[PDB]
């Protein structure tokens, strides 16, 4: 289900998309896929919205079985983009579209890549071919008010605020990860290992964590503990009936103990209009890998492109 806001029913294809400053306001926008609509408008000359009637909870995932999507509060890359935690970059030509997802008819798809996050949009009136590589005309998208059907998120991914690590420990992890995957030559066009000869690229479903340096750390064997840190980001605030609280209202709730809430929120922030509650999510994920513990920015199991030693 949704985090705060029930799915959007839009009318004005041409309605502006406001920059809302409250955190719960931004989560509300994320619930209604307004961030992805914003993305399409900005990058691929698209009028209107995606997410009609379904919102974020009806988005399409590759793989279709999504563990992290059953947790309404786990942040997808796109969600993280809207919260300024990372950038889902507009695809360049050299960005690789992985095979396997049912791209046909999609209007937007994103995937974690080895060195970032890439998103692919189609203009107004167009959608993707099966290969994902071309935007061709589609009369079913004429409405400009398109169902969540048309949004594709690749990967079992959770993003979250990160405890930045020094370059030293990133280099150690990058090296550890190189020795775990000695036969990988490049991932998503990035040199992973030095290779003399190299296979044709092929899909690669790999576990990875983003620890905020030049590229991700793909992992063979790792352990994950989820910890509920009950920080302010873990709570959303809403007025009864009328959706999310104001930026100002949310702030005083989370800093002054003057609003109503559920039992965890009252414990950490205080309680005596707005109500704040725990978002449904397992917590922040801590990764043990390379004999290190680390709080990554994103964590996931996603498809990328790899070549192998020949």
């Amino acid at each position: 289900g949704p985090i705060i806001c029930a799915g959007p029913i839009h009318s004005n294809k041409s309605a502006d998309i406001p920059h809302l400053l409250g955190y719960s306001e931004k989560i509300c926008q994320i619930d209604r896929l307004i961030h992805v609509s914003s993305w399409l408008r900005n990058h691929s000359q698209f009028q209107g919205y995606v997410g009609q009637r379904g919102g974020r909870s009806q988005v399409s995932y590759y793989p279709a079985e999504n563990s992290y999507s059953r947790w309404s509060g786990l942040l997808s890359p796109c969600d993280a983009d809207w919260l300024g935690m990372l950038v889902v970059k507009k695809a360049k030509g050299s960005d690789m579209i992985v095979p396997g997802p049912s791209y046909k008819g999609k209007v937007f798809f994103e995937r974690p890549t080895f060195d970032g996050y890439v998103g692919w949009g189609c203009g107004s009136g167009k959608s993707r071919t099966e290969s994902g590589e071309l935007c061709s005309s589609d009369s079913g998208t004429s409405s400009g008010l398109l169902p969540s059907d048309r949004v594709l998120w690749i990967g079992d991914v959770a993003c979250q605020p990160m405890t930045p690590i020094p370059e030293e420990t990133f280099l150690e992890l990058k090296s550890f990860s190189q020795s775990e995957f000695p036969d990988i030559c490049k991932i998503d066009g990035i040199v992973f290992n030095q290779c003399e000869g190299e296979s044709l690229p092929q899909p690669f479903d790999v576990a990875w964590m983003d620890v905020g340096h030049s590229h991700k750390i793909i992992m063979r064997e790792h352990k994950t503990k989820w910890v509920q840190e009950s920080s302010s980001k873990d709570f959303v605030c809403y007025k009864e009936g009328t959706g999310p609280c104001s930026e100002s209202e949310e702030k005083t709730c989370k800093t002054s103990g003057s609003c109503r809430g559920d039992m965890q929120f009252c414990k950490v922030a205080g309680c005596e209009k707005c109500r704040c509650s725990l978002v449904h999510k397992p917590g922040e994920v801590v990764v043990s890998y390379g004999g290190m513990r680390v709080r990554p920015k994103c964590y996931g199991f996603s498809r990328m492109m790899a070549t192998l030693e020949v």
Partner: nanobody
Amino acid sequence: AVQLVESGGGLVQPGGSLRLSCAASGFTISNADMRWYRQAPGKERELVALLLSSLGGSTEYADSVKGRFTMFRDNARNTVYLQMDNLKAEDTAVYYCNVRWTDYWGQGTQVTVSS
């Protein structure tokens, strides 16, 4: 080493036809996914047609060229083709042949359409 050699570009009057070939070395196109790009001067590299082994051999075309260009392969000959019919001035470009997800590009062949 992978090699891609293109052929078949040239001068053609509007309405004319050309067949572009891409002979490949160092992989078998019967498993590869192949793409045809074109690059006009000033404009950006635009993807024009695909043959996707990942899709069982299916074929996909950009909207501008749909219905005039035809991509196909000769597995025996390890060669992929782009048949271009009813050529327009806007088809003038250098055409490139590329292996999907790789920096394997053909030399490029020049297609010029003019009356």
